[PDB]
Design a protein around this nucleic acid. Sequence first.
RNA 1: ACCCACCCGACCCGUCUUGAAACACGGACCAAGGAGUCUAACACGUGCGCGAGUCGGGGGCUCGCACGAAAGCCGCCGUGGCGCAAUGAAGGUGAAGGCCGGCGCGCUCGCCGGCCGAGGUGGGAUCCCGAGGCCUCUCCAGUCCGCCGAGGGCGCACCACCGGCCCGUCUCGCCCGCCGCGCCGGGGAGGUGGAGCACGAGCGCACGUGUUAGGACCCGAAAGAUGGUGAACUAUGCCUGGGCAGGGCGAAGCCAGAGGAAACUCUGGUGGAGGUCCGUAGCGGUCCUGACGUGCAAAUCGGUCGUCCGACCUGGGUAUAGGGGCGAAAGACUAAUCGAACCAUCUAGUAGCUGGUUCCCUCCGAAGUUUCCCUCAGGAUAGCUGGCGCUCUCGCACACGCAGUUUUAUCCGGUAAAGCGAAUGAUUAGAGGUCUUGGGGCCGAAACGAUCUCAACCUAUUCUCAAACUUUAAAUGGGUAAGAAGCCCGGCUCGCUGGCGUGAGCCGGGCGUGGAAUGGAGUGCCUAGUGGGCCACUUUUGGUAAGCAGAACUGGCGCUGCGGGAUGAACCGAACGCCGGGUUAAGGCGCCCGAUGCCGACGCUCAUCAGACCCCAGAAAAGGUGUUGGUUGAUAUAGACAGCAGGACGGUGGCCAUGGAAGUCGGAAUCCGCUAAGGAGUGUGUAACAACUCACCUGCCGAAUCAACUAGCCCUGAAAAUGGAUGGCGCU
RNA 2: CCCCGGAGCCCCGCGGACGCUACGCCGCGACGAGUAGGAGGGCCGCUGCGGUGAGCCUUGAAGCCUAGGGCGCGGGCCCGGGUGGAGCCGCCGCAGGUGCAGAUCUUGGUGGUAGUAGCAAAUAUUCAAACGAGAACUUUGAAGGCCGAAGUGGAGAAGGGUU
RNA 3: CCUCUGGCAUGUUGGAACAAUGUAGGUAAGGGAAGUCGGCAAGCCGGAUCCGUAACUUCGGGAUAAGGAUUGGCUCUAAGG
RNA 4: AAGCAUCGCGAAGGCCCGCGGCGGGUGUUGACGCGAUGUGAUUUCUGCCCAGUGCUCUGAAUGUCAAAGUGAAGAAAUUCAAUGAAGCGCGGGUAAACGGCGGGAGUAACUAUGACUCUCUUAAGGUAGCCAAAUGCCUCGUCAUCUAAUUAGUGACGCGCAUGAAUGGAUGAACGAGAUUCCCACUGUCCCUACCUACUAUCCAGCGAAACCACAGCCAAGGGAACGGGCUUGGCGGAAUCAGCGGGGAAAGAAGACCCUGUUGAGCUUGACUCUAGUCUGGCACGGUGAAGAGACAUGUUUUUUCACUGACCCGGUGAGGCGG
RNA 5: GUGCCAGGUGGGGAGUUUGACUGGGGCGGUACACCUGUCAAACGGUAACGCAGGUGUCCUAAGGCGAGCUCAGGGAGGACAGAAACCUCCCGUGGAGCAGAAGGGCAAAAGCUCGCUUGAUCUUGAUUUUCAGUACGAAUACAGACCGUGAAAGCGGGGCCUCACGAUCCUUCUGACCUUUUGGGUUUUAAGCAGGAGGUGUCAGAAAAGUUACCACAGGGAUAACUGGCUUGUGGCGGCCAAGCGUUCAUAGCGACGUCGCUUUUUGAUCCUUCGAUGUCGGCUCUUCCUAUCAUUGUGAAGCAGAAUUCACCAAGCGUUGGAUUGUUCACCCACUAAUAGGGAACGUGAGCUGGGUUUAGACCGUCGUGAGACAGGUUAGUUUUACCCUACUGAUGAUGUGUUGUUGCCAUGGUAAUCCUGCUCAGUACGAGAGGAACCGCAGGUUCAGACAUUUGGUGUAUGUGCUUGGCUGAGGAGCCAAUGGGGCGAAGCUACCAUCUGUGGGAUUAUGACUGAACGCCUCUAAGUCAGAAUCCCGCCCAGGCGGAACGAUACGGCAGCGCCGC
Length: 75
Amino acid sequence: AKSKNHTTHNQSRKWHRNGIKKPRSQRYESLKGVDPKFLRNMRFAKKHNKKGLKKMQANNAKAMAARAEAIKALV
RNA sequence: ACCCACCCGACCCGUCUUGAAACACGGACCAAGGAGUCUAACACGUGCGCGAGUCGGGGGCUCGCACGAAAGCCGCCGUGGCGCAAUGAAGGUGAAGGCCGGCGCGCUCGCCGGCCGAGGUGGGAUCCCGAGGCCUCUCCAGUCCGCCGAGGGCGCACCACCGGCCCGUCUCGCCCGCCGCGCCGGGGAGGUGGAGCACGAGCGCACGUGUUAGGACCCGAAAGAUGGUGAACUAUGCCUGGGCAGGGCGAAGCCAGAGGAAACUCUGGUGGAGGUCCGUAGCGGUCCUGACGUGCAAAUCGGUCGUCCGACCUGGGUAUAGGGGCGAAAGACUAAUCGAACCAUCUAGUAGCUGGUUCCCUCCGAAGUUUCCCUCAGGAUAGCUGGCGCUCUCGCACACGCAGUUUUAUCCGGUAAAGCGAAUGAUUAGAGGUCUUGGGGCCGAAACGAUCUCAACCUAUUCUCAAACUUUAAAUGGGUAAGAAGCCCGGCUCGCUGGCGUGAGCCGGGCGUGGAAUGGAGUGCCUAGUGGGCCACUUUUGGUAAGCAGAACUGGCGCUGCGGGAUGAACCGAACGCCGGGUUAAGGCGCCCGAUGCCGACGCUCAUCAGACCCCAGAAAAGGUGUUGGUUGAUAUAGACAGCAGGACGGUGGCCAUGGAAGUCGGAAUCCGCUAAGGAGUGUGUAACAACUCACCUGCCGAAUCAACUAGCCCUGAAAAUGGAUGGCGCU
RNA sequence: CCCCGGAGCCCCGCGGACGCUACGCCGCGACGAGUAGGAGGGCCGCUGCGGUGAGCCUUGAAGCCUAGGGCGCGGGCCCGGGUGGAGCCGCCGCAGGUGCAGAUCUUGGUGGUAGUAGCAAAUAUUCAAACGAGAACUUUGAAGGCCGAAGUGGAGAAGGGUU
RNA sequence: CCUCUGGCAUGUUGGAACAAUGUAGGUAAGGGAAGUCGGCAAGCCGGAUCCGUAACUUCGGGAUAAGGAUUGGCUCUAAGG
RNA sequence: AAGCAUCGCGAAGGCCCGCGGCGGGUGUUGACGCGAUGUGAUUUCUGCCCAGUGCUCUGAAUGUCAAAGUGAAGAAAUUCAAUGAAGCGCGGGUAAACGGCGGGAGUAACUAUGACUCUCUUAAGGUAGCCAAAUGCCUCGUCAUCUAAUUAGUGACGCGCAUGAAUGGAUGAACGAGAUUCCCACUGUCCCUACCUACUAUCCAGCGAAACCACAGCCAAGGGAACGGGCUUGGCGGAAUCAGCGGGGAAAGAAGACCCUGUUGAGCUUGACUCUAGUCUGGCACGGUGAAGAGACAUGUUUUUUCACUGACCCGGUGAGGCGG
RNA sequence: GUGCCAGGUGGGGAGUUUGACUGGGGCGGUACACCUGUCAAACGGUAACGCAGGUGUCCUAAGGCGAGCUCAGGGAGGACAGAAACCUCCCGUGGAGCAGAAGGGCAAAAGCUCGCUUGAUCUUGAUUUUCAGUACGAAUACAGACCGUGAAAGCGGGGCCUCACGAUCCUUCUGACCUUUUGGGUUUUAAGCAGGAGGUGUCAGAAAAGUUACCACAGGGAUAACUGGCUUGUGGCGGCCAAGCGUUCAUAGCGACGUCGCUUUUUGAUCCUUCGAUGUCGGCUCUUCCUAUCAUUGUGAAGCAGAAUUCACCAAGCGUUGGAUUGUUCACCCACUAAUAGGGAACGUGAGCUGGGUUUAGACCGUCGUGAGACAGGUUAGUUUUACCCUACUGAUGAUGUGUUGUUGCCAUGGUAAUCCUGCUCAGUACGAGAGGAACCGCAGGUUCAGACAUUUGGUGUAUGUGCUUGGCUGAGGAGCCAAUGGGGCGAAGCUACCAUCUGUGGGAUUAUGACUGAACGCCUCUAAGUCAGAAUCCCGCCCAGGCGGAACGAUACGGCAGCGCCGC
Ligand SMILES: [Mg+2]
Ligand SMILES: [Mg+2]
Ligand SMILES: [Mg+2]
Ligand SMILES: [Mg+2]
Ligand SMILES: [Mg+2]
Ligand SMILES: [Mg+2]
Ligand SMILES: [Mg+2]
Ligand SMILES: [Mg+2]
Ligand SMILES: [Mg+2]
Ligand SMILES: [Mg+2]
Ligand SMILES: [Mg+2]
Ligand SMILES: [Mg+2]
Ligand SMILES: [Mg+2]
Ligand SMILES: [Mg+2]
Ligand SMILES: [Mg+2]
Ligand SMILES: [Mg+2]
Ligand SMILES: [Mg+2]
Ligand SMILES: [Mg+2]
Ligand SMILES: [Mg+2]
Ligand SMILES: [Mg+2]
Ligand SMILES: [Mg+2]
Ligand SMILES: [Mg+2]
Ligand SMILES: [Mg+2]
Ligand SMILES: [Mg+2]
Ligand SMILES: [Mg+2]
Ligand SMILES: [Mg+2]
Ligand SMILES: [Mg+2]
Ligand SMILES: [Mg+2]
Ligand SMILES: [Mg+2]
Ligand SMILES: [Mg+2]
Ligand SMILES: [Mg+2]
Ligand SMILES: [Mg+2]
Ligand SMILES: [Mg+2]
Ligand SMILES: [Mg+2]
Ligand SMILES: [Mg+2]
Ligand SMILES: [Mg+2]
Ligand SMILES: [Mg+2]
Ligand SMILES: [Mg+2]
Ligand SMILES: [Mg+2]
Ligand SMILES: [Mg+2]
Ligand SMILES: [Mg+2]
Ligand SMILES: [Mg+2]
Ligand SMILES: [Mg+2]
Ligand SMILES: [Mg+2]
Ligand SMILES: [Mg+2]
Ligand SMILES: [Mg+2]
Ligand SMILES: [Mg+2]
Ligand SMILES: [Mg+2]
Ligand SMILES: [Mg+2]
Ligand SMILES: [Mg+2]
Ligand SMILES: [Mg+2]
Ligand SMILES: [Mg+2]
Ligand SMILES: [Mg+2]
Ligand SMILES: [Mg+2]
Ligand SMILES: [Mg+2]
Ligand SMILES: [Mg+2]
Ligand SMILES: [Mg+2]
Ligand SMILES: [Mg+2]
Ligand SMILES: [Mg+2]
Ligand SMILES: [Mg+2]
Ligand SMILES: [Mg+2]
Ligand SMILES: [Mg+2]
Ligand SMILES: [Mg+2]
Ligand SMILES: [Mg+2]
Ligand SMILES: [Mg+2]
Ligand SMILES: [Mg+2]
Ligand SMILES: [Mg+2]
Ligand SMILES: [Mg+2]
Ligand SMILES: [Mg+2]
Ligand SMILES: [Mg+2]
Ligand SMILES: [Mg+2]
Ligand SMILES: [Mg+2]
Ligand SMILES: [Mg+2]
Ligand SMILES: [Mg+2]
Ligand SMILES: [Mg+2]
Ligand SMILES: [Mg+2]
Ligand SMILES: [Mg+2]
Ligand SMILES: [Mg+2]
Ligand SMILES: [Mg+2]
Ligand SMILES: [Mg+2]
Ligand SMILES: [Mg+2]
Ligand SMILES: [Mg+2]
Ligand SMILES: [Mg+2]
Ligand SMILES: [Mg+2]
């Protein structure tokens, strides 16, 4: 009582019926697999980004003043 | 709508199957019954009520119950279920930070008073501001009905990510507090595991589907256990009764006679014994494998048979009862039942195994494949499929993304091919070189002294190869990029790295058609069936081959009708709601049979086995002056080809062959003379000869001929059994 | 520079269907195969129940037959005629023991076979009369036979129970 | 096998013809197993009287071995109380 | 089956039944008996082997050896050590128990073979007999004979795939509904068939079923699921029937018995896996009294060896009839 | 002895098991867990009991660093020493070695030799590989420590890379000032967490011997034994070439080394139909068909002088025997014959027969197995079921049209039939040295078959015709009867036998073949046009049946009612 062992006959048709997809590419991909010391220290950098907010806001205000002087000299 | 007639079509329904009209199974016909139900646990989706709550279970109070064993109500309105908090094996622990100021060295750490109060980035349906444009019967001013709104936002749900917090576990270190200053308790930073939190969503009832446990869609076993009933049949033991003609052989014992000496021996009788013989009744059943074999009969009849005084037959009573009995032993008998009787119950035992499964229409619609399983007739899991939806975009003047597609650049191969004068392996033959020895060898006592030979040597050559060889090396393919998730700037953070620097992450700002054509896309639940396949173009394995077994891409049949191939799974065309007109595909147009009933074109073909359209149903090597063409080489006026006609002599019995070659079984040889001409010869045939007889030319007829290959059609090769098939008639 | 209780118009900003069971009506475009299977609609069918039709019915209910008229693609349904004699149906909802062509299906009935196979084991019957509507089978008489005293004879037991 | 006493109507029916193939009996010239797996079936012999009876043997048998002759009727004779 | 030969048992026994008991069968019995076997009359013979599997004998000369008990540690549960019954191991016997009876080398004045000697796995290596058997693949072995012809029959040979001595060998009178071969007579078994008889079958008066049945029924070829009554192309086909007939309906008869599958059974066997009745042995209780004797610890405790009594308990007899001084 | 424990024995008895894949199943193998090269069609993936193989190990170094060298082989040299012992020089892309099978990789290495060592250590995750994107095993970068090596860069958490291995539960060990041991406290113990081990080779993992011929059940043509189907290796048969055999001479007859085809009359191969059954081998009987022709008819070629015998064609019309043995299919033998040719039809033929041997159940022997039992080993005895249905066929009534009937006939169509041998003359002739030895036409007849028939003969016989008889019965004689037809003789009629007898046919077309005339091809030629002879072939005549076929002729309803046919309309 022998039988048929293995084939791939109707399989490509079955696979292309439901539309073989590219994987779900998303913006801001995950960090699973990145090396742990560099994940550790980017976590420290994201922890200490809140330090220096007054310097960042003041320098952004001076950059707005610089763009205002530039558009005043241009217009 | 009843019957009949004609033309075309039309094999009998259900099922197992790759394939059914099947010489596969079920099936005379008709009426009635007849097969997916009910409870519980869940899961998902839907309908309703309430909502961080929900439900009244159970019970109690009202109505004596027609309607009722209904309904209404409850400091029981929550005892309790589920949810609202999870995580550890457990002791246990248990989900918030940020901004401003002050005190300690701001020491990224500890302690005090107010605020925001549940983080941030990107994509995000709706909404808000919205410059400006579009006007009116005329120019300005101008509150208003408006529409489109460039641009910017707070951003619902949801997704991706980065953060933050809770519990378990691990690493590095420090600080705080006391009723008992301890093997006390708590806290920090960073990894990692959880079914967690991150301003709830559940509860209760009802409906649909799916998975189960239950009889579980229905019918079905071979079985197992428990408790009983039978020895009227049969098996054996016991008790008490009944029965078994007539003949044959003649055991012991006994009598008499004869022969001899007793010893004894013969003869003639009598006698009636035998698990003795023929044979009746009785008992049983060898052979005809006779009769019958839907019988006289669920085991009989006829002839022929074995036995018939003892291991004989038989009635009644009685005893042995089922894993038991009993057996002159056959697993035989035990009530037509025996390799474990019968009746009832468990029991509607189980079955991956057969069969069947009951109304219509519409829409969508498969698989025989991956992996695992004592799995190969089956399940689970992915795949294929259906339903329920959600999130967005809009031919209403204004599209992000996606492909069995191509292009533009960029890489991958090691297959076809080709090569081995390149490597590895095989393998052919010459040529030149004492590389270097050796064996059969020849001249030599020997010598690399002359001749060559092969085993292994070299140098350039040459012939053929390789799925498990390869320098090369395609065609077809496989990934990528063709932008807003992209570039260009400015600045913070880092505990990584660090001569300064790098790298990564956060912010803020500026620039849009990112090659061709076509698409409206993304996503979450349940979820049946399937898990036996088969055929065909191309590639290919094993096999002599197969309508054989097994593979790769693709398409079909299965699941599919229709036109054609005469018939028909898979071939060609083409896919299907019911029709009318027209036009075709594939096939055809003498008749069957719709259409060439064209004054069709050009040739080939004669078959005493003609030939007639993929699959496909039949043919080969070889041969033919049968016939039609082509290729090559010759000769013909210096007077062809066949047709009547003169000849095969001499050196030469040349030369090995003695067993015979003056041509003669055969082989190295292989030219002159006469010359017009005979090749040291094509045959007839000889112990050898002799003889007959073929190149060349003349006398006669005077222009197309000869030879070898090769392609068409036809013929031989070519022989099977019922009468036989281009489908038939037939057709030149 | 006027209102349409009426400019009178291919549009009436004055109320605004004949067209609206909005679970309805209407207008374009594309498509239509199908087993196993899945989903939806049934104003398809059976039975019973709560409502509903001032429903039907001895001036004829259900059932059954029909060479009649029909409708729906279809499941099926509505009438016409005949039999029948006592209950029955439509709609909104609920519930189920709800649709048969098969299962060597269960029960019941009936065909072809078919007026067929068969009524053939043990030798054998024949003539006249009686009875009767009726004689091959009854009876009587006569003839010929068979069982042949281990019988086809005369009586018991087991068994049957009135034979 | 035939008859007497006793019993019966030929065994779930009869009539007409005498086809094949059957079932059960028989008979066949010549051959005698040549048929067939196989003398299967069928066929020969068979009672009694008088002779005669082998191999072998457990000395009992084999044995009715094998193989011959005779068998009727009528009329007598002899013997058997 | 008689004959033959074994095995066990002297009664608190052998074999066996029984859920059970001072239970029961043999047994109303006692080795000339009962129970379990093998072989199968008479004659003759029954060879060798105890290595294996069985069975059986004794043995503190003893490897393993459970429970109970003994000693040591601890707070104890617990652990350790010695002792350690029967049985398995060790050692004898046993084949009329199951059974087995092969190779190698040397060696005889022709060759060949081996009377003789040594060894193996494992213990001897087929003895007397017998045979191409009911037993022999080759094979239809070879020879003689029976025949015209013999794979048959009989008699011999042994090289015997794979004979063989109570898993009995050989012979053998009589007997056998046992199986084969030949001969005499005989016959339709046949050449080669023929005829007659009775009952059927045929027709008729009366009575009258059953199996089976998708629809039903004429063939050739093609294809098909690969042997068609139906499809296609041809041949063709004409009402209703009777008596036969065996070619077809892959005719009927029964869910193939053969072969396979099932994680379906049943009968049986054992060196399968778990168990169990019975049986043997050890410990505790029923279970008392005395005598001497050995061992261990140690300066009373334990293991105990046999004998004596009856008082528990068991057996036998009686009509419980004289038992002890 | 009893009651209760403990140990041995225990198929007497009980329950249960006896894997899977498989060109059917057992036996043989693992294609059952893995690894390499190929298959494999240039990403990956890809099957078979496809090919070559390998594995369940080994290593305290063969792991990890650092340093120095180059390996195999060849040439040249050197005392023993040669082809291989040891020393040196040169060439030396790896042609060696790296533990193993293979592939890849590697030259101041990944090889050899040294020096030091234990990264072959502990703890979180992530990823790859078979994959469902689950495990296990193996591997890949990292992270935190602690280390080794080196001067450092760095390298190393096993083997140069691809395999060398294993869930739940249970047990064992190790670790924490770890948790619980349920009223509280201590301790022993026990349970927990994590890591390692004890193993499931059927390798994602039951604990598992056989037999059944006494067998049973649910199924399968998913799967065999038969036949049918495809193929033809094999079996059988036929060609192509032509080195040779044949006194010379390849081809009269043969034919090596090679090669091309047919058949399903043999065995193979596959599993397409059948397991809710298709009766499984032989022999007997009987019919039809094929030719690959043994004989007969007609011919051609011979190493054909005659006889006899081989090769080849047309050709299946008619024949192909009786037996011993064996169940035989086959086989061999004896005899006859003209010759004793080969086959098919579900390996033709069991509702036709037989049952001989396969292939049930009972037995005996031999081998194997402890045993039950097995043995294409041998022997023995072993129930052969049904037609009355439809078709086909054999016979028989019939039927439709001819107005109805009868006589006489024709004919389409269908079947078909005759075959073979011996003796005499030819003729001891042709021929031949002889030995031997024909043929045509005639004459007489036989074999097989067919169709009849009973004068004779033989059989049958129940004219129950006639005698003779056994037993019984009617009183005896006579006459008879019964005894399933009493027996035995003879026997009428009728049936019947190659067991008696009679009869059995002629043409036409032509095949093969031999020819005529005569081209093509101014020659020749059976052929191309034409023409002749020509046979068991074919067809018809003879014979049998007579069509949903006709023809000619006769009579056609006087009756007690009637009714028909021709003619003019
Ligand atoms: Mg499969
Ligand atoms: Mg199936
Ligand atoms: Mg299917
Ligand atoms: Mg099939
Ligand atoms: Mg069908
Ligand atoms: Mg068929
Ligand atoms: Mg079936
Ligand atoms: Mg049927
Ligand atoms: Mg019904
Ligand atoms: Mg579910
Ligand atoms: Mg819900
Ligand atoms: Mg709960
Ligand atoms: Mg059921
Ligand atoms: Mg269910
Ligand atoms: Mg049941
Ligand atoms: Mg059981
Ligand atoms: Mg019998
Ligand atoms: Mg019989
Ligand atoms: Mg009959
Ligand atoms: Mg038996
Ligand atoms: Mg559809
Ligand atoms: Mg299965
Ligand atoms: Mg490759
Ligand atoms: Mg190539
Ligand atoms: Mg299946
Ligand atoms: Mg197949
Ligand atoms: Mg195409
Ligand atoms: Mg109900
Ligand atoms: Mg019905
Ligand atoms: Mg009748
Ligand atoms: Mg009768
Ligand atoms: Mg009486
Ligand atoms: Mg009588
Ligand atoms: Mg009678
Ligand atoms: Mg009568
Ligand atoms: Mg009677
Ligand atoms: Mg005779
Ligand atoms: Mg014979
Ligand atoms: Mg006889
Ligand atoms: Mg005798
Ligand atoms: Mg014995
Ligand atoms: Mg002995
Ligand atoms: Mg022994
Ligand atoms: Mg001997
Ligand atoms: Mg014989
Ligand atoms: Mg003999
Ligand atoms: Mg022996
Ligand atoms: Mg023996
Ligand atoms: Mg049919
Ligand atoms: Mg038939
Ligand atoms: Mg079956
Ligand atoms: Mg069955
Ligand atoms: Mg299975
Ligand atoms: Mg079971
Ligand atoms: Mg049983
Ligand atoms: Mg055991
Ligand atoms: Mg057992
Ligand atoms: Mg069992
Ligand atoms: Mg198997
Ligand atoms: Mg590829
Ligand atoms: Mg180095
Ligand atoms: Mg590290
Ligand atoms: Mg290494
Ligand atoms: Mg047997
Ligand atoms: Mg067998
Ligand atoms: Mg099959
Ligand atoms: Mg076959
Ligand atoms: Mg061949
Ligand atoms: Mg020659
Ligand atoms: Mg049948
Ligand atoms: Mg049949
Ligand atoms: Mg021929
Ligand atoms: Mg014969
Ligand atoms: Mg046959
Ligand atoms: Mg037949
Ligand atoms: Mg039969
Ligand atoms: Mg037989
Ligand atoms: Mg048998
Ligand atoms: Mg009849
Ligand atoms: Mg004719
Ligand atoms: Mg008289
Ligand atoms: Mg003629
Ligand atoms: Mg001619
Ligand atoms: Mg002529």
